[PDB]
Design a binder for this molecule. Structure first.
Ligand code: DCP
Ligand code: MG
Ligand code: MG
Length: 343
DNA sequence: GGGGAAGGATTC
DNA sequence: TCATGGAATCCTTCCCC
């Protein structure tokens, strides 16, 4: 057969805060990244469902949130803490399948093909899984089940929150036909608008255009991706993800183009980036700057060997110098990203 | 001879 | 200070050796 079971934790961060403070439950809760630039500068990382009903969701400014919802609990985000809960939950999942792809802090794919003989037993597995996370972590999750990762992902998107959905073989075929292509994982705002403009609305539409014409408009990779899902021939195996880069970006108190004013922030970011590397060694470093009008600009360097902390400090100042004498705009956010890990 | 670096798009 | 975090995947483009 080939059964994938996907698990996505409901309103994750905000839910961990309710579990930690069960008096929050049933009322609006908003998890915030406060940038420190003025009282309440920053964005919302997520909010529970009672906040979302009023428009308060992930990505908006805290300032927006607070004008639509004065009276909500606003909490700073403590990713560490959510990461500890996630790991315990990923270890429960591990118990239902050896073959598990941890996709992020709040979601994982299980290949349950050897555990379960059909979609009916998969569902029942969906449910002991749900009852088990609830019993052990007091966290509700949504489960999607289907023949591959993507449809398993779509199935969970359609059933959230606290849901479980199967998209069996006939349903795959219906969805390829009626599912708005904007709802396919990995297809964003810019790509969807490109596709509408050409009048491609459904996965099915992609089988009836010059592949070469699709590829032009959206890139070879997305074309191929969509077409393979539209042919029902998508079957990327469940695999261990290997982290490829680590980094840190911060917001300055104020916009500067002044190197001595910027460096305490760059060095702050190297030191936290280096600490999180823990034992792995990068051959590439990039300095990333977000300018006052929000363009992203970066300069990097790839060395034939690993970059020690001391080389990071001197390469990063140099790369900052290159940014500063290229672009004339002032800098609002500065950070560093290490990648191309040895071994 | 590509290849590497900068940016694009998406998602966390 | 004067909405627009932080983070990490591909992938694409385009310039120079
Ligand atoms: N712009 C964003 C979007 C999400 N997240 C974080 C907060 C979420 O708790 C977590 C997982 O994202 P989801 O899309 O799964 O959304 P939630 O889990 O919050 O809600 P739900 O899945 O219930 O829609 O990632 C973030 O930091 N920044
Ligand atoms: Mg998720
Ligand atoms: Mg979620």
């Amino acid at each position: 057969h080939m059964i994938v079971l996907f698990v996505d934790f409901d309103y994750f961060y905000a839910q961990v805060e309710e579990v930690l403070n069960p008096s929050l439950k049933g009322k609006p809760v908003v998890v915030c990244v406060f940038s420190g630039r003025f009282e309440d500068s920053g964005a919302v990382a997520t909010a529970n469902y009672e906040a979302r009903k009023f428009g308060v969701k992930a990505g908006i400014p805290i300032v927006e949130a607070k004008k639509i919802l004065p009276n909500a609990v606003y909490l700073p985000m403590r990713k560490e803490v959510y990461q500890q809960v996630s790991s315990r939950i990923m270890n429960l999942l591990r118990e239902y399948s050896e073959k598990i792809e941890i996709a992020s802090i709040d979601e994982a794919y299980l290949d349950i093909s050897d555990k379960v003989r059909d979609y009916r037993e998969a569902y029942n597995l969906g449910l002991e899984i749900k009852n088990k996370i609830l019993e052990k972590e007091k966290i509700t999750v949504t489960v999607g089940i289907s023949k591959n990762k993507v449809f398993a992902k779509i199935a969970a998107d359609m059933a959230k929150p606290n849901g479980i959905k199967v998209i069996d073989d006939e349903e795959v075929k219906r969805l390829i036909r009626e599912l708005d292509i904007a709802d396919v994982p990995g297809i964003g705002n810019i790509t969807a608008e490109k596709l509408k403009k050409l009048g491609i609305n459904k996965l099915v539409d992609t089988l009836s255009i010059e592949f070469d014409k699709l590829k032009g408009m959206i890139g070879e990779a997305k074309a191929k991706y969509l077409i393979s899902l539209a042919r029902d021939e998508y079957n990327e195996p469940i695999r261990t993800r290997v982290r490829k880069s680590i980094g840190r970006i911060v917001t300055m108190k104020r916009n500067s183009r002044n190197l001595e004013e910027i460096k305490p922030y760059l060095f702050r970011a190297i030191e936290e980036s280096y600490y999180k590397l823990d034992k792995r060694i990068p051959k590439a470093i990039h300095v990333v700057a977000v300018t006052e009008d929000l363009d992203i600009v970066s300069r990097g360097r790839t060395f034939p060997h690993g970059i020690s902390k001391e080389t990071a400090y001197s390469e990063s100042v140099k790369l900052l110098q290159k940014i500063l004498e290229e672009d004339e705009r002032k800098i609002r956010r500065i950070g560093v990203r290490f990648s191309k890990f040895i071994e």
